[PDB]
Amino acid sequence: MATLLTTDDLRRALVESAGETDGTDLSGDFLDLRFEDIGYDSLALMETAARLESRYGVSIPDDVAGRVDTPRELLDLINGALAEAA
Template sequence: MTAAPFTLDDLKRVLLEGSGAPEGVDLDAADVPDTEFEQLGYDSLALLETASRIEREYGIELDESVVGDATTPRAFVAAVAAHAA
């Protein structure tokens, strides 16, 4: 497991590695942390892939509810951080 906390930049990196960048979306925009994943162009399969990559990279096991309940990047990062603690 990585000692550093999981951040929004980590989430963006994993999203880009696993699912790429949706056309016309700037993941560095100020409103991205509170924008619904669906509005950003990421569907449930992209989030499942992201969760799987995070589990492998950080050596944690995420509940299935993380993908369903964390509908924004900020919520996803908080959920991962809570599981990693």
């Protein structure tokens, strides 16, 4: 048993990192939009990644980090990576 990454948790983490609360509303459908579509800069995005690692005790690999595009796939990746742990 461990604390998995949830929708709302992910939604919070993006906000907690950036703080950008103008124009971009994650109160709807964000998982299907790309990071740049939800108004998140690459730098602020990787800052968010550090927050994920710090919370769930995980770590995101170099190559796969730059191979994602939408939040959904990021969520799926870390969820699946946790699912491989017992």
